[PDB]
A paper describes a structure:
The NIMA-related kinases (Neks) are a family of Ser/Thr protein kinases, first discovered in Aspergillus nidulans that are conserved in eukaryotes. Nek7 is 1 of 11 Neks found in humans, and contributes to the assembly of a robust mitotic spindle apparatus. Human Nek7 is a 34.5 kDa protein, comprising a singular canonical kinase domain made up of a small, 5 β-stranded, N-terminal lobe linked to a larger, mostly α-helical C-terminal lobe. The intervening cleft between the two lobes forms the ATP-binding pocket and active site in which phosphoryl transfer takes place.
We, therefore, obtained crystals of Nek7WT apo and Nek7WT.51 in the same form as the Nek7SRS. All three structures have four chains in the asymmetric unit, and in each case, chain D has a poorly ordered N-lobe. The analysis, therefore, focussed on chains A–C. In contrast, the side chain of Y97 adopted the ‘up’ position in chain A of the Nek7WT.51 structure, and was poorly resolved in chain A of the monoclinic Nek7WT structure and was not modelled. These conformational differences might be explained by crystal packing interactions: chains B and C of the monoclinic structures form a symmetric, back-to-back, head-to-tail dimer that covers the surface proximal to Y97, whereas this region of chain A is exposed to solvent. A comparison of the apo-Nek7WT and Nek7WT.51 structures indicates that the presence of compound 51 does not alter the conformation of the R-spine. Although there might be a stabilising effect of compound 51 on chain A, as the side-chain of Y97 is clear only in the presence of the compound, this might also simply reflect crystal-to-crystal variability. The orientation of the substituted phenyl group of compound 51 is clearly different between the two structures: when bound to Nek2, the phenyl ring lies flat against Gly92, and the sulphonamide-amine substituent points towards Asp93; when bound to Nek7SRS or Nek7WT the phenyl ring is rotated so that the sulphonamide-amine points towards the N-lobe where it interacts with the side chain of Arg50. Dose-response experiments with Nek7WT and Nek7SRS demonstrated that a Nek2 inhibitor, compound 51, successfully inhibited both enzymes. The apparent IC50 values calculated in these experiments are 79.01 µM and 40.13 µM for Nek7WT and Nek7SRS, respectively.
Residue numbers in the entry: 19 to 183, 199 to 300
Write the structure that this text describes.
């Protein structure tokens, strides 16, 4: 406990008491922390740009989180502040109480119980409005994975803003190094919906090889879903969002539209 300056709000580590290390970080170190000013709890990602990032990388790296600031939407986590302290770069964002979707898929795979299509839309639909908002404002969520989709005790899904520029869901464009574009978010969004209904990524196997993995991705050879429990509309939707050719994947809005229609049907 050091001199807490209340005039800097959430812009100093001196106004937060770190509770626990709630984050898994090869590149990060998130913490469940509590503020000493208004007591609101928050998460605190401790990025290690220190020397691991060149000045040119740092500049744009901070330029993007400033854009992350430019987004308010219930289904995406909010950016409360960011600052350099200890030469680390600390980012404080909203904490989600309940837990992680990645931590829940293994939960259902643990109980050998599938996820009914009724709920898959209950969560997916929120995740599309969220992404639609980022795409609405030309923001590109660069790492959509189950380990970045958290739910609140209420049940709202908070999308986790990360970024750059093995990732969980690799893109066809990124294998060829063609470039990450808006429809590359449609890719991971597709594979994600697949993972909720199949309890595991689309392109996988006991091999664990790196070569065969993408030769499948550009080919699009994934194990079809069980039509007994998942509608044709679902199985088809994800089949479109992972078409290797980006230009043949749907706009973010269309995915949101389809997700909306069937959320009503499935309730
Ligand atoms: C096992 N359980 C019963 C223990 C109780 C558990 N309670 S808990 O303490 O509040 C708890 C535990 C875990 C998650 C969360 N919610 C959360 N976690 C984040 O970091 C996750 C990390 C960051 C990216 C890569 C890997 C995942 C967030 N980052 C931004 N917002 C976040 N919100 C809360």
């Amino acid at each position: 406990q050091k001199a807490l300056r209340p005039d800097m709000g959430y812009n100093t580590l001196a106004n937060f008491r770190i509770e626990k290390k709630i984050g898994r970080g090869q590149f990060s170190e998130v913490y469940r922390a509590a503020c000493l000013l208004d007591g609101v709890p928050v998460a605190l990602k401790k990025v290690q740009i220190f020397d691991l990032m060149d000045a040119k990388a740092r500049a744009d790296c901070i330029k993007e989180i400033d854009l992350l600031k430019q987004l308010n939407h219930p289904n995406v986590i909010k950016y409360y502040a960011s600052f350099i302290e200890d030469n680390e770069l600390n980012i404080v964002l909203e904490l989600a109480d309940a837990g992680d979707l990645s931590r829940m898929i293994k939960h259902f795979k643990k109980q050998k119980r599938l996820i009914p299509e009724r709920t898959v839309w209950k969560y997916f639909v929120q995740l599309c409005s969220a992404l639609e908002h980022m795409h609405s404002r030309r923001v590109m969520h660069r790492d959509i994975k189950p380990a970045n989709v958290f739910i609140t005790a209420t049940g709202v899904v908070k999308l986790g803003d990360l970024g750059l520029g093995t990732p969980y869901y690799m893109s066809p464009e990124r294998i060829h190094e063609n470039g990450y574009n808006f429809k590359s978010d449609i890719w991971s969004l597709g594979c994600l919906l697949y993972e909720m209904a199949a309890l595991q990524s689309p392109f996988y196997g006991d091999k664990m090889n790196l070569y065969s993995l993408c030769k499948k991705i550009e080919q699009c050879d994934y194990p079809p879903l069980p039509s007994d429990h998942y509608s044709e509309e679902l199985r088809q939707l994800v089949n479109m969002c992972i078409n290797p050719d980006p230009e043949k994947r749907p706009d973010v809005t269309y995915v949101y539209d389809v997700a909306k229609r069937m959320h009503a049907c499935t309730a």
